[PDB]
Amino acid sequence: MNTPKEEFQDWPIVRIAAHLPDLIVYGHFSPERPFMDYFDGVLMFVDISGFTAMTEKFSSAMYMDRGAEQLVEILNYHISAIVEKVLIFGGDILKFAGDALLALWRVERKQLKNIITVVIKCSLEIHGLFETQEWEEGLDIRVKIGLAAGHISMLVFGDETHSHFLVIGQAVDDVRLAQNMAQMNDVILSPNCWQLCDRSMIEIESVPDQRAVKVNFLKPPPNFNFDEFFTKCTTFMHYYPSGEHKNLLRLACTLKPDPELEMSLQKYVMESILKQIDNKQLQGYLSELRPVTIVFVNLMFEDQDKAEEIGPAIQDAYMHITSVLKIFQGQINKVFMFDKGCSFLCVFGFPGEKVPDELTHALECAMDIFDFCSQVHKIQTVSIGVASGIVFCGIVGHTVRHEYTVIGQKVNLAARMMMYYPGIVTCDSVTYNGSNLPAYFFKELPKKVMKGVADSGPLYQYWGRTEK
Ligand SMILES: Nc1nonc1C(=O)c1ccccc1
Numbered sequence: 001m002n003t004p005k006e007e008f009q010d011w012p013i014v015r016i017a018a019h020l021p022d023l024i025v026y027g028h029f030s031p032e033r034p035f036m037d038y039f040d041g042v043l044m045f046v047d048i049s050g051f052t053a054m055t056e057k058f059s060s061a062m063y064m065d066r067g068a069e070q071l072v073e074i075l076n077y078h079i080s081a082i083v084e085k086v087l088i089f090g091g092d093i094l095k096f097a098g099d100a101l102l103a104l105w106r107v108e109r110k111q112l113k114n115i116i117t118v119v120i121k122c123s124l125e126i127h128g129l130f131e132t133q134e135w136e137e138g139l140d141i142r143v144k145i146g147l148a149a150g151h152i153s154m155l156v157f158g159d160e161t162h163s164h165f166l167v168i169g170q171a172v173d174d175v176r177l178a179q180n181m182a183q184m185n186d187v188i189l190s191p192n193c194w195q196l197c198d199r200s201m202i203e204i205e206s207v208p209d210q211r212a213v214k215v216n217f218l219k220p221p222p223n224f225n226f227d228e229f230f231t232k233c234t235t236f237m238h239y240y241p242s243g244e245h246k247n248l249l250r251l252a253c254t255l256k257p258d259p260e261l262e263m264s265l266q267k268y269v270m271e272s273i274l275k276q277i278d279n280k281q282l283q284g285y286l287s288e289l290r291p292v293t294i295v296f297v298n299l300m301f302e303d304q305d306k307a308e309e310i311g312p313a314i315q316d317a318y319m320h321i322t323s324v325l326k327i328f329q330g331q332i333n334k335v336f337m338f339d340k341g342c343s344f345l346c347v348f349g350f351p352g353e354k355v356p357d358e359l360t361h362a363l364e365c366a367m368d369i370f371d372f373c374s375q376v377h378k379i380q381t382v383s384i385g386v387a388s389g390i391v392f393c394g395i396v397g398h399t400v401r402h403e404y405t406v407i408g409q410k411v412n413l414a415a416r417m418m419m420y421y422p423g424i425v426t427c428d429s430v431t432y433n434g435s436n437l438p439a440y441f442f443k444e445l446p447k448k449v450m451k452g453v454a455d456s457g458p459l460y461q462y463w464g465r466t467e468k
Helices: 012-017 049-059 067-088 109-129 170-181 191-196 226-234 259-266 271-277 307-327 358-373 409-420 429-435
Strands: 035-047 092-096 100-106 144-158 163-168 187-189 202-207 210-218 288-301 331-338 341-348 379-398 401-407 425-427 442-444 460-462
Touching: 012 259, 012 271, 035 109, 035 170, 035 307, 049 067, 049 379, 067 092, 067 100, 067 109, 067 288, 067 379, 067 401, 092 379, 092 401, 100 109, 109 144, 109 187, 109 191, 109 210, 109 226, 144 170, 144 191, 144 307, 163 307, 163 331, 170 187, 170 191, 170 210, 170 331, 187 191, 191 210, 288 307, 288 358, 288 409, 307 331, 307 341, 307 358, 331 401, 341 358, 341 409, 358 379, 358 425, 358 429, 358 460, 379 409, 379 429, 409 425, 429 460
Parallel strands: 144 187, 379 425
Antiparallel strands: 035 100, 035 144, 092 100, 144 163, 187 210, 202 210, 288 341, 288 379, 331 341, 379 401, 425 460, 442 460
């Protein structure tokens, strides 16, 4: 008999799995929401704002109405290379944002030391991708890397139709802190990472007024062989592609149809993405420069380190947020957490979710969320930033690991507003002027210098319908 080869690997379940980390794909968790689990790992936070700041100029007439198509193409070219490095070195890309990606090497406590070495090497090789690369006249196509290590908590929250996850805890906070100490081309280790690492491998230096350290060099001992060392480390990497599947970047590429599993995984993925996955929408429909309203919600907790308290709080907030968003076809694009604040990047006006009065509704939705979440047990402060303008939407990443992501100055603005104007609902000038709501529903705010925003324009507090 003949032996035709090539296992078919393009099933819907596999396509869905591209949008998710191994943490979720192979997780098999209880149905309770919230669900929490705990482990140890090494984290890598790669700041990619250097080249995703490209977005503004892709709206220029120069790109002849193909700005979004060109932007996703060039971004994915670069980001794909980063993802491949992460994957080949054994890491799990947890999420993408417009300005960063976060990767995890989950391992038993005893192997943290050796895995940090692996992750440093990976980091250095990532920087190596960009050492001599630019466009037009600007080589700011470079990245900044923070690494952290230690205890990590995982939270899964959602309802019967939608799920979201976060990793949280000090190591997660640490990786964020480390990355924003990094200059271009730097690899910065959190204090704990530095404490736990193989100091014989690496030369570091101090970071002024900081216990974090900068990696100057990976200088391995005389008879060290990284490839053999890596192979030893793979013993502790549950899903590293191997044997007959050593040619694949992800084990998830080998997933077979399993309706129960697919039911669980699809809950993490937006319906419009599922439509594309199911070949019921053109594969390029979701790459666009689109006017939207961003409602960025930040929840700060009474006790920031107590995962057991924050989980139920986020779940309670989520249940309300999703109900309010349904009422106006708003969608949660991302959920993020560091600094102890949990933030929901909500979007009004995504593809196929048009509808006029987007501004009035965004503001009313923001206020509703604010009022409700402010009453949630353990939520100390709610802050909401509302900004409206043209943003890039598209699936960003590698073929095998990518996510629908929104990128733009207005996303950054809403994000900065919620942090620099805590405890209130704020909006930009577009939103204020477009709502046409009475002017006394607002308060004109002092201008604040916000990191990453040049010329925010006049900003406003949405005070609401009444003085009280
Ligand atoms: N915490 C988290 N758990 O999953 N993702 C995050 C997160 O904050 C993040 C932020 C920016 C980019 C990528 C991830």
